Amino acid sequence: NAGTDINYLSQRTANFSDTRKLDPKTWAAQTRRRIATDFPKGVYYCDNR
Amino acid sequence: QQLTPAQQAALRNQQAMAANLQARQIVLQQSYPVIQQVETQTFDPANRSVFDVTPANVGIVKGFLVKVTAAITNNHATEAVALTDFGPANLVQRVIYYDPDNQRHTETSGWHLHFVNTAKQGAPFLSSMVTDSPIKYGDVMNVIDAPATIAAGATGELTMYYWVPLAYSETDLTGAVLANVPQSKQRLKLEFANNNTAFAAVGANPLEAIYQGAGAADCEFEEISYTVYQSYLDQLPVGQNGYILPLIDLSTLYNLENSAQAGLTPNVDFVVQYANLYRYLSTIAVFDNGGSFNAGTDINYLSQRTANFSDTRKLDPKTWAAQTRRRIATDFPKGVYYCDNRDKPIYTLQYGNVGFVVNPKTVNQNARLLMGYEYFTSRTELVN
Amino acid sequence: VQQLTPAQQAALRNQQAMAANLQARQIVLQQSYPVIQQVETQTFDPANRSVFDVTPANVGIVKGFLVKVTAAITNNHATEAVALTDFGPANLVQRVIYYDPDNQRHTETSGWHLHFVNTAKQGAPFLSSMVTDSPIKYGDVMNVIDAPATIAAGATGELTMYYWVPLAYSETDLTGAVLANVPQSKQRLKLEFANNNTAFAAVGANPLEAIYQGAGAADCEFEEISYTVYQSYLDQLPVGQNGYILPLIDLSTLYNLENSAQAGLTPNVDFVVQYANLYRYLSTIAVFDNGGSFNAGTDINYLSQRTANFSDTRKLDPKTWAAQTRRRIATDFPKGVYYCDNRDKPIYTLQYGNVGFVVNPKTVNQNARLLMGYEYFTSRTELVNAGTISTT
Amino acid sequence: QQAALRNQQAMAANLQARQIVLQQSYPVIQQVETQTFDPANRSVFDVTPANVGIVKGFLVKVTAAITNNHATEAVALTDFGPANLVQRVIYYDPDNQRHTETSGWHLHFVNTAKQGAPFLSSMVTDSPIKYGDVMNVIDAPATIAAGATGELTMYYWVPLAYSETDLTGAVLANVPQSKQRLKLEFANNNTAFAAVGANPLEAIYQGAGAADCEFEEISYTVYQSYLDQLPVGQNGYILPLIDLSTLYNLENSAQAGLTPNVDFVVQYANLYRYLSTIAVFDNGGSFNAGTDINYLSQRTANFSDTRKLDPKTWAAQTRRRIATDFPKGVYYCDNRDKPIYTLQYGNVGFVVNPKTVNQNARLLMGYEYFTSRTELVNAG
Amino acid sequence: NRSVFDVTPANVGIVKGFLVKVTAAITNNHATEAVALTDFGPANLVQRVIYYDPDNQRHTETSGWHLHFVNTAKQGAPFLSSMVTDSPIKYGDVMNVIDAPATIAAGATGELTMYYWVPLAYSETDLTGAVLANVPQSKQRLKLEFAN
Amino acid sequence: NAGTDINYLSQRTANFSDTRKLDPKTWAAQTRRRIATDFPKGVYYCDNRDKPIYTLQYGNVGFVVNPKTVNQNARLLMGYEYFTSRTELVNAGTISTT
């Protein structure tokens, strides 16, 4: 599914809490800045380069 | 020695500039970026359309990503409405930010902020590029989206995103806002569209509207929702005196603002002077020709001119558009013209007064130029 | 021969201290530059919230805050109107409290008392526009402090009110000012606004704290309220071989406004409200809330200020008392509101209740009481360790 | 290290002389000239003051009769009304140096700012004793109906000395045969009446019958205020040399180029110590009560601001100075205790960020300032 | 309309914790059926609480139900409860400090009150975990995410 | 009444302000921690055992009640537990704020 089965995604840690707890569309927005489009349905990407 | 105060102050700068850059480099190499939700609200703009969001006071703030969704219903008996050229970019009419000292930074329209977001990305902001790939990449998540038309009796769903910058970029902290402290509240103020601004009747000016068509009078928002995410740097490096901070970066304002200018007449140079002291990074000029937005056909040429009547880029509309295609890989909507001055910001006092010029071929009633600026500028000094 | 005298000055001592304080004050005023700056603006619906804590900027020497309040009031009643109470827009703010960086409170009073002091200090109704025969169109052009006399059934009225919350006594006397450059510790300016429960009084109800009263009151409501706080301070403080040249007495003295309520009035009997010791009372305001009725002196025999052993220093009939006030503000305060100026020679008892404010009532209704308002100076240490108000 | 001391001592020595002059001389107010004329023939006059003692200023009385010859339409006072009976004033001292050069309306607004209330007005009170507008000192009919003739009276104080107690800017005129020049340009049939829809800024009346309005006549009387019987000492005349070598002037200017939501900055010049600033927002002939402005301020350019305020709060500060508001679109700023003094040209600017800008918009500026004589007076 | 709030604590002295009073009115508009309290009931009025100190260091971040169970464990009895006894003097649930109707019938409106203690300091006598402020900087942040 | 006729209660020192200005239910919550239940209707308790109220000057500290509704013949009946210096009570003591 295109994010409709997810509340949010994040990277969490171990002091702060989450460093990027985001709804699926906002998470996808960050990915659009990296590959100029969305990955296929149900595929989520995270850049920590 | 002879103390040449002017030469010296410059020297003092030169050292100031170097210190700033080093501090910036150290900050970037040493804190950890965080983006976290600050506030979400769902409402009917018929009830309320202005909201004052209170950002969290933590570390150095770089900017805010604002997600906006909306549902619009066309209850006209028979007629549809179609997206205007700006469409969902008009979901937010105005945005204003104030820092902890209550100093105002950006104050501009949603459409201008959106065009700058696009210029800074180098492509339509958060868009999905079309390719021949058989793998199913594409508009999967509808990050920024709005139906091309909303038929009589139908309800359409829209999604829009705006990045409200404080810092100039992810690597250049000029304009960022400094949280090691005490200070006040910013007042990220968001003024949303409502039934009056979002729908334009046939023949009415579509500038600020989202949809225009024969069914406009019976269109209504059902709801609008926003979620503001704050992007900042945490775990600020500490050294000797306390926090290692880029003092020039944090005491410089990086702002967007817009205004409207009128007084255009056919074949005469319409000159909009740059308001001195600011370092203008970009200029957007929208030729709202009395509600008509044309693809360059109502313009002879555009230019940037300095106090000697010397043009640095006097170009016909298509050639002007060509330069923009090199910047954002496509054209801005009809009647929207962009000018990049990022590497050499327009700065009067460096070379006399400068002006943005438009020589119109046709001028309808109520014609005007809506100017959008992106700038830094700070304090200024001198002596005999 | 109210008593202790001018021996209070022999006691403080540091003619050297005063000489220094005063010289430093003058250098600061001469060398620094005045700034008035917006620190916060907010719009809200009283139905959701009405209490706000504003955080001032910690910069230089803070003199005070100018608070601008605007509001839209809708009379949703079907057929009845409402009209302004005597205090009207002065009740847009119910209370104010200020805490400095050292957690010490300065002013803690009602919006109406604060407003009356603003008027007393200006020498005329605060920020008012005086009427003259000038043919040139000066006048109430900008509606600085403004409110519709009535709001008819179904109508919406727009109001504007301003309050000056003082820290410093005046633009030239920095007594009471706050040094906020020196600690990261925050200041607190607490504001409690009128709400749908306090702004509207039904016919026959007490209008003291209300803005409008009338037959349509039950159906009146705020459409919204907005406030903007401007902070006034001195920047670019002068430095010497010591460092910052500062008036130490000015900055270690509190200039506060405070209110209180007293009851127990009986016809033809002196009702005495005792002044506390250690405070130097600059002015006194007494409001005779005669069970919800506010009269123009007709319910009072006389008012006075009295010292235990001597008698009264100004026992006067209500009209003569009002005459003294007309010399101070060029008009009368609203019905039932009485003012007393003691600025040149502040009431200072050294013993609690040496000094009392007197009201001998002619008629006393049910639930009668005197609402007192005070302006005073104090030695910040004396208020910390040895102070009450209120004489029972 | 001696500079500041030398300055303090010179100031201490000015001040003593000033006090002796105020104490020993005697104030005189005397008529120097009266004239009645028809604006159709002339409207510019050069009055020659008397060269006696220390001149402090001139009180100019102006009366006029205006006839509305229109068949059926009336006219009504503009916001400035009788303050536009004098369009401009210019004063030249015996040394050919100009002091004030400004408009009649700006001069009038400064007269008001200095009085602390509408100049020479009659305040309304509840007094049963019949005080009130008995003498119609400054007066003009609110409207002049078709066929009617209205009578107007206006007074202006042209200052040389700053006040009755501060002689800064005063002129020593008993020292030369060289004449003073007080130039006055009066309203005429072309400036006094504005047609509906026309800019009323410089007019006295506006309305449907304006085209047929005319002056029946105008009269003026100039009274000169000076100090006589100047005190003499040892070396001779005891005089405040700083006071008499300083100019106290009012001047006006116009600036254009306003754009919605953009800071419009009018730079202050260097050398001048600006005591007050008046800015009139002539929004293309429309004068609004702050609704066309976002905020006003005084700044170090790009920096800020020492008083960036919304229009109502700006007006609140003015209410503390003149006990009322100036007319629509007129904004005042008091800097008397700490005059704007840049050394640098433009370090400081007056700011107006407009909300709405009509065609032909502009800011009409008015300034009160002190500046500075290069060289002392001629002494005996 | 809104369920997440960022409260800004005052910066004064050593902070030990926060007592959060929460009240609510709930209406059951079902045509015929009632609803009954869950085992956690009003403890679920607050879904999550997160605190950050002046240096933006996160301390507690947990659910309302977990915070409530710890409040109970630290008290040694159900948090802020009223114990039942045979006393004829009218002590008892007089003030409804923590309270919620056992059921809300179709068409009825129930009122609830709940309290949570968000600790920084471990206890009134053990200041381990307390937060100063002699910290030039920020402000603290107490984020409350409510039920909807 | 069970707190419904009161806006708030507090203990205040002249110059600082209140050390515990609380709504009636929150005031009752503190009491529940002390006696495991509520005192009867209209009865309010305040524990200052670890740091006893000790003014050195009369009235430096006061107990505050801001009533929401006041009926005819209303009054506050106060009860105190204290340790005094036997000599101070002998020579310098009253109870009483009018």
CSV table of C-alpha atoms in Angstrom, one decimal, chain C residues 16 26-27 30 48 69 102 119 128 131 147 180 256 269 282 286 318 373 386:
chain,number,residue,atom,x,y,z
C,16,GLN,CA,26.3,59.9,49.4
C,26,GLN,CA,21.3,61.0,34.9
C,27,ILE,CA,24.3,59.4,33.1
C,30,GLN,CA,21.9,60.8,29.0
C,48,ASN,CA,-11.0,28.5,25.2
C,69,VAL,CA,-5.9,45.0,23.5
C,102,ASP,CA,14.8,37.4,40.6
C,119,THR,CA,-4.8,58.4,34.1
C,128,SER,CA,-7.7,60.4,25.5
C,131,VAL,CA,-12.2,68.2,22.5
C,147,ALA,CA,-15.7,51.3,22.6
C,180,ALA,CA,17.4,42.6,32.6
C,256,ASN,CA,4.2,48.6,42.5
C,269,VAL,CA,-19.5,55.1,61.2
C,282,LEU,CA,2.2,57.5,46.5
C,286,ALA,CA,-11.0,53.7,46.9
C,318,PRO,CA,-17.3,64.2,48.7
C,373,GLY,CA,-5.9,50.4,44.9
C,386,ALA,CA,8.3,42.9,56.8
